[PDB]
Amino acid sequence: DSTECSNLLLQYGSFCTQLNRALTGIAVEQDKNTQEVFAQVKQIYKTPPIKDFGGFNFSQILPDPSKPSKRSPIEDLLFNKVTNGLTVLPPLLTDEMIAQYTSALLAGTITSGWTFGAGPALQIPFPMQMAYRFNGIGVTQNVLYENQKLIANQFNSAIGKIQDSLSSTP
Amino acid sequence: YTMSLGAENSVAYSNNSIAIPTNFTISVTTEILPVSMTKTSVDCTMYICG
Amino acid sequence: FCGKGYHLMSFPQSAPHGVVFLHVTYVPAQEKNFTTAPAICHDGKAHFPREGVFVSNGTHWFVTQRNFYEPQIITTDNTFVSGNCDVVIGIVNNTVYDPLQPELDS
Numbered sequence: 424d425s426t427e428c429s430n431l432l433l434q435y436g437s438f439c440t441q442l443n444r445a446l447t448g449i450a451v452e453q454d455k456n457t458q459e460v461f462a463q464v465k466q467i468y469k470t471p472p473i474k475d476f477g478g479f480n481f482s483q484i485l486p487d488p489s490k491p492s493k494r495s496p497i498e499d500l501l502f503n504k505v506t507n508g509l510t511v512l513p514p515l516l517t518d519e520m521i522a523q524y525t526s527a528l529l530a531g532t533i534t535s536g537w538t539f540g541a542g543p544a545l546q547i548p549f550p551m552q553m554a555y556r557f558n559g560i561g562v563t564q565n566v567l568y569e570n571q572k573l574i575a576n577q578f579n580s581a582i583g584k585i586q587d588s589l590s591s592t593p
Numbered sequence: 594y595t596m597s598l599g600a601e602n603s604v605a606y607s608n609n610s611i612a613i614p615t616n617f618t619i620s621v622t623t624e625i626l627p628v629s630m631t632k633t634s635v636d637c638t639m640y641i642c643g
Numbered sequence: 644f645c646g647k648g649y650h651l652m653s654f655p656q657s658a659p660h661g662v663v664f665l666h667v668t669y670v671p672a673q674e675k676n677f678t679t680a681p682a683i684c685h686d687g688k689a690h691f692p693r694e695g696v697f698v699s700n701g702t703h704w705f706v707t708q709r710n711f712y713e714p715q716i717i718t719t720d721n722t723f724v725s726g727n728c729d730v731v732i733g734i735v736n737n738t739v740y741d742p743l744q745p746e747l748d749s
């Protein structure tokens with residue numbers, strides 16, 4: 424609040440304007456980064472009420488209706504595990520809207536595969552989508568269909584191990 | 594206002610139904626990428642002292 | 644990486660201090676619902692599409708390519724046999740045509 428200090432500071436020119444402009448550029452760049460990463464879909468997709476995906480369990484990654492934050496158990500664990508003229512500007516996208524974007528992406532990739540990323544979301548059963556992914560890596564569809572229960576059990580076990588590993592590693 | 598993230602779309606998922614496209618659109622989109630800047634040189638002695 | 648949609652090709656254009664890419668992409672449109680199955684049960688054998696997907700318009704079963712609707716008759720030339728019908732969940736019963744059958748019939 425010193426007037427004499429500000430009067431002497433005016434002799435140095437537009438240094439303060441340069442620093443404020445650089446900080447403003449960084450601040451808008453962070454919001455641009457969040458838009459580029461998370462806002463890649465213009466449709467907010469939702470999962471069906473019946474979670475019949477041919478044995479595949481997505482409860483650890485889908486949003487929990489019981490929680491007010493509408494986050495997944497994995498996302499909730501991630502948020503719990505992360506802890507003089509200065510101002511902190513809030514982010515343009517809040518955490519619930521970012522979680523909503525991730526939920527839309529999860530619903531699109533579960534119910535429609537990769538179709539929603541290239542155009543309109545085309546529904547496909549999840550085992551058939553997994554068979555398409557199996558064909559992408561050079562494994563025939565029959566291998567997926569014959570061992571569907573084993574693949575679903577392995578996927579559920581791996582997702583549970585991911586949650587345990589995140590909860591158990593500092 | 595509070596922003597709207599996107600238009601709501603509920604995909605009609607069921608265990609035995611698929612959606613197959615019957616037509617297509619040839620879409621051309623623009624992507625602008627900067628490559629170079631203006632090449633500037635400053636004579637340090639002339640700038641500071643003339 | 645090269646536009647929104649399935650990328651077909653791209654064109655470069657010079658710009659002052661920059662480049663403009665015209666990305667020509669293929670976007671699916673006018674989608675239609677069909678009833679689908681993982682496999683076709685015929686003669687105690689399970690048939691799976693070689694490159695397409697089994698679809699049904701309500702009464703008849705066909706095989707089509709995944710990114711465009713072009714229904715074709717389910718034959719031995721566009722399907723492959725792996726195992727019986729007891730393992731695949733959701734297999735349906737439909738006939739599989741054989742192109743060689745009229746050749747030895749005549």
Ligand SMILES: *[C@@H]1O[C@H](CO)[C@@H](O[C@@H]2O[C@H](CO)[C@@H](O)[C@H](O)[C@H]2NC(C)=O)[C@H](O)[C@H]1NC(C)=O
Pocket residue numbers: 474480481482
């Ligand atoms: C999907 O996985 C979740 C979590 O692993 C299962 O929820 C469990 O259900 C059992 C039996 O009802 C409970 O004893 C557990 O406490 C539940 N776990 C949690 C974290 O809530 C769920 O049953 C699985 N299957 C489906 C179809 O959702």
Ligand SMILES: *[C@@H]1O[C@H](CO)[C@@H](O[C@@H]2O[C@H](CO)[C@@H](O)[C@H](O)[C@H]2NC(C)=O)[C@H](O)[C@H]1NC(C)=O
Pocket residue numbers: 615616617618673
């Ligand atoms: C697929 O969509 C194209 C449009 O891109 C359709 O072409 C149009 O057909 C109508 C009726 O024949 C014409 O009046 C329009 O002028 C056509 N548009 C163009 C750009 O040619 C085409 O008929 C559609 N095909 C199917 C099977 O639905």
Ligand SMILES: *[C@@H]1O[C@H](CO)[C@@H](O[C@@H]2O[C@H](CO)[C@@H](O)[C@H](O)[C@H]2NC(C)=O)[C@H](O)[C@H]1NC(C)=O
Pocket residue numbers: 603604605612674675676
């Ligand atoms: C495929 O079928 C589903 C359900 O039979 C259609 O989804 C319905 O679309 C209408 C019109 O938008 C909605 O009013 C209904 O609520 C939707 N039902 C459900 C369960 O989501 C879907 O539009 C059909 N798709 C095509 C291309 O015909």
Ligand SMILES: *[C@@H]1O[C@H](CO)[C@@H](O[C@@H]2O[C@H](CO)[C@@H](O)[C@H](O)[C@H]2NC(C)=O)[C@H](O)[C@H]1NC(C)=O
Pocket residue numbers: 700701702703
């Ligand atoms: C599903 O598609 C098939 C093939 O296009 C339809 O079968 C044809 O139906 C017409 C209408 O009576 C007949 O004139 C043709 O002879 C049929 N073809 C064959 C090979 O039988 C079938 O009717 C369609 N089903 C529905 C519900 O639309």
Ligand SMILES: *[C@@H]1O[C@H](CO)[C@@H](O[C@@H]2O[C@H](CO)[C@@H](O)[C@H](O)[C@H]2NC(C)=O)[C@H](O)[C@H]1NC(C)=O
Pocket residue numbers: 684687736
């Ligand atoms: C599909 O066809 C198979 C074989 O033709 C049917 O399986 C038969 O089912 C009857 C009654 O359920 C049994 O008595 C036979 O012994 C079964 N045969 C075999 C080889 O398993 C099957 O039920 C048919 N499915 C539908 C929906 O019609």
Ligand SMILES: *[C@@H]1O[C@H](CO)[C@@H](O)[C@H](O)[C@H]1NC(C)=O
Pocket residue numbers: 475608609680732733734
């Ligand atoms: C789809 O689910 C129903 C029960 O809701 C079941 O009767 C049917 O066999 C299932 N079909 C497939 C292909 O899994």
